[PDB]
Each structure stands twice: as structure tokens, then as C-alpha cells.
């Protein structure tokens, strides 16, 4: 049976890269998104992102470098309308209105969801515990928040994050202008997540490296003291625990390697979950804390705080962003 | 675009001098036994 042989090949763990059924979806979508991204980043013509006939050039051939180049989001006139190639009268019209962005982000989001499913699938085929995909759900939720959920809440894929470095910075600055994300607790939890993730990464790495058991001489690298597949632990967990328990106090230190590695998984994953949820909840315009004119003296004069200085910076960004796109006093979306 | 001219050769040297250095150290490692 050809179908049985195909099923055996798809689910085979002997392939150099595992495919699986999630990979059967993942490989074509990510290949399409990757090829279209490379082509658009090099050679796409300028895109009228704001829908006001003001095309923004994001490709290398139209005057960009690596830093300033981007795949520009689709037109504000399109909004949330589905804009495939066959909906356009020609490829010139599709390129003018930012169709490549919609193609890339839709294929990428599908392929990355199937990447998460593929991680589960391979863990199941290898007899592993299944929750690496749960850890990967945090950056995937972040990608969904900036590419899909924020355009949905704001009503246009033009407000999605551009596929570029300076476009990303533009997204960040305009987002702070419109939503005050720095004062949002979910973004603060995300900063705690990534700062703590970097801290605990450096901490765990330095504590394991500090307690490596002497297996080599002074000339060779210490990494040759570990052999792949060896049964014994390559470092002294008790010595690292003794060091770190004397560094703070005994009960702030993990003596359990499993609890420590669960904490290493859990802290940045939960923090990034919260910051992705912050982006989505601000997509429905539930913004960060507003303390403008909160402190008032006895007469009634406004006493400024640091929040008022942040408000001045946000006002500068707000009045300069998309400088020709607004006709009315309130930036309602 | 009106870019800096030396930015070509600098970039080339920035690739070339370290990479071949590593390549040298790799190839002489492989010929050892």
C-alpha cells in the first residue's frame, strides 16, 4: 500500500529532519513565507501602507540597507480584507498595496503553529515528555499578537509589525505613543520575564561551569571533560548549591535540579505569555496606566510626575506619527 | 546611493581576515593525527 509507506515515511524518526503531519503542513507554508520574504526584502517596490498614496520603500534595491529594509505591511485601505494575489488585477497592484506582507505573515503564522505541533509530535515519537511545545507557545503567542491580533483589534493589517528592523522600531514607538505600553503591567511582567531569563541563564550557566569536575589538564578545553552520552553528572550539584546558598542564604538555593530547571523554563515563558497578552489586550485598546495630572496641589495646580514627562514624549510621538493620515482630532484607531 | 566607499573593503576585510583565520585553524586541526 502506497499510503502505508507514505505514512511510515512521514512519521519516521530516522529522517535527518523530522517531518510528521504538522511538518507536512509546516514545510510548504514556511518555504513559501521564506522565499517570498527574501524576494520582497530584496526587490519589492514601495508600498502605500497608510492608504494615502504615500508609498514606503522597504526593499534593498529601492534604497535600503539591512537595518532600514522591511517588508511593508499591507495598505490601510485594505484593512482586514483578505488580499491574495488572485484578488488583485495585476502583480503591480498587488505589490503596490502590500500583498506580500499578507502572504508572508499568513504562511508564517500557520507554519509556526505547525512548528509547535511538530515539536509535540517528535516528543511523542521519541518517548519524551510533551511540554517543549508549551514553552514555544510563548514566542508563538508573541508573533500572533504582533502580526494578527493587533491588526484585528485595530482593524487593519497596516498596523501589524513590519518585517524589518527599523519597521519594528517604528511599531514600538507608535505603540508606546498610542497605548503607553511601558506603564502596562503585562509589559512590565514581560520585562521581568526577559531580564530574569537572561539573569537566570547567566546564573545557571556560571554555576554549572563553576562546579565542573576536573577531568582535563590545563592545556585542553574543559569541554572535553564531558563525553556525549555519559552516565555520570559532569558537575558537582552539591558544590554549586553550597556556593549559591552561601551567596544569599541556604533556602534561596535550589538543591533539586528538576525544580531548578522547571523554574528556568517557567519564569521567562510565563513572563512572555503575559507580555504577548499585553499586546493583545492593548489591541483592544485597554491601555497602560494613565497618571496624567494625578498629583494635584491644595489650590488645584497640576504637580508633574515622571508620568507627565512620559506623557510629553508620548505626545511628541503621537502628533508626529503618520503625519498625513489623520483628518480628525482623535486618533480613534 | 551615496555610501562610504571604504565601507566595501572594510566589510570585506571584516569577513575575510577572521574567517580565513578560523579556516586555517580548522584545516590544520583536520590534518593532525
Amino acid at each position: 500500500n502506497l499510503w502505508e509507506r507514505f505514512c511510515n515515511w512521514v512519521t519516521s524518526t530516522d529522517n535527518r529532519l523530522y517531518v510528521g503531519w504538522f511538518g507536512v503542513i509546516m514545510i510548504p507554508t514556511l518555504l513559501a513565507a521564506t522565499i517570498c520574504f527574501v524576494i520582497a526584502f530584496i526587490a519589492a517596490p514601495p508600498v502605500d501602507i497608510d492608504g494615502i498614496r504615500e508609498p514606503v520603500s522597504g526593499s534593498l534595491l529601492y534604497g535600503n540597507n539591512i537595518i532600514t529594509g522591511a517588508v511593508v505591511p499591507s495598505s490601510n485601505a485594505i484593512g482586514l480584507h483578505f488580499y491574495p494575489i488572485w484578488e488583485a488585477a495585476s502583480l503591480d497592484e498587488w505589490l503596490y498595496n502590500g500583498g506580500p506582507y499578507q502572504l508572508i505573515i499568513f504562511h508564517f503564522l500557520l507554519g509556526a503553529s505547525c512548528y509547535m505541533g511538530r515539536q509535540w509530535e517528535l516528543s511523542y515519537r521519541l518517548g519524551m515528555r510533551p511540554w517543549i511545545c508549551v514553552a514555544y507557545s510563548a514566542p508563538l503567542a508573541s508573533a500572533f499578537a504582533v502580526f494578527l491580533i493587533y491588526p484585528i483589534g485595530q482593524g487593519s493589517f497596516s498596523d501589524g509589525m513590519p518585517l524589518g528592523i527599523s519597521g519594528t522600531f517604528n511599531f514600538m514607538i507608535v505603540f508606546q505613543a498610542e497605548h503607553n505600553i511601558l506603564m502596562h503591567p503585562f509589559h512590565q511582567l514581560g520585562v521581568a520575564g526577559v531580564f530574569g531569563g537572561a539573569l537566570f541563564c547567566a546564573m545557571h550557566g556560571s554555576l554549572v561551569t563553576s562546579s565542573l569536575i576536573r577531568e582535563t589538564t590545563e592545556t585542553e578545553s574543559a569541554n572535553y571533560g564531558y563525553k556525549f552520552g555519559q552516565e555520570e553528572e559532569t558537575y558537582n550539584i552539591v558544590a554549586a548549591h553550597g556556593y549559591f546558598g552561601r551567596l544569599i542564604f541556604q533556602y534561596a538555593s535550589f538543591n533539586n535540579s528538576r525544580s531548578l530547571h522547571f523554574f528556568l523554563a517557567a519564569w521567562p515563558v510565563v513572563g512572555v505569555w503575559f507580555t504577548a497578552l499585553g499586546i493583545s489586550t492593548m489591541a483592544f485598546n485597554l491601555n497602560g496606566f494613565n497618571f496624567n495630572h494625578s498629583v494635584i496641589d491644595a489650590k488645584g495646580n497640576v504637580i508633574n510626575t515622571w508620568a507627565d514627562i512620559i506623557n510629553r514624549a508620548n505626545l511628541g510621538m503621537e502628533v508626529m506619527h503618520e503625519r498625513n493620515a489623520h483628518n480628525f482630532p482623535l486618533d480613534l484607531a | 546611493m551615496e555610501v562610504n566607499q571604504l565601507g566595501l573593503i572594510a566589510t570585506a576585510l571584516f569577513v575575510l581576515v577572521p574567517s580565513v583565520f578560523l579556516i586555517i585553524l580548522y584545516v590544520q586541526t583536520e590534518s593532525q593525527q
Binding site: R16, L17, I42, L60, L61, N65, I66, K227, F228, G229, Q230 | M1, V3, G7, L8, T11, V15
Partner: peptide
């Protein structure tokens, strides 16, 4: 001239990805 440089460096990175995946040092389990 600068566009050629960026595309060349990117293509070298992709070639390096290919060699690092398919022509790696095999992890020999001891």
C-alpha cells in the same frame, strides 16, 4: 554595490546553515 554585499553575506549565512546541519560533526554516543 552595497546591495550585492548584503545579499552575499546573507547567502553565505544560508550556505553555512546547510553545512552546519548536514555536514556537522556527528554526535558519537560513547
Amino acid at each position: 554595490m552595497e546591495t550585492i554585499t548584503y545579499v552575499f553575506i546573507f547567502a553565505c549565512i544560508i550556505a553555512l546553515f546547510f553545512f552546519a546541519i548536514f555536514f556537522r560533526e556527528p554526535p558519537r554516543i560513547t
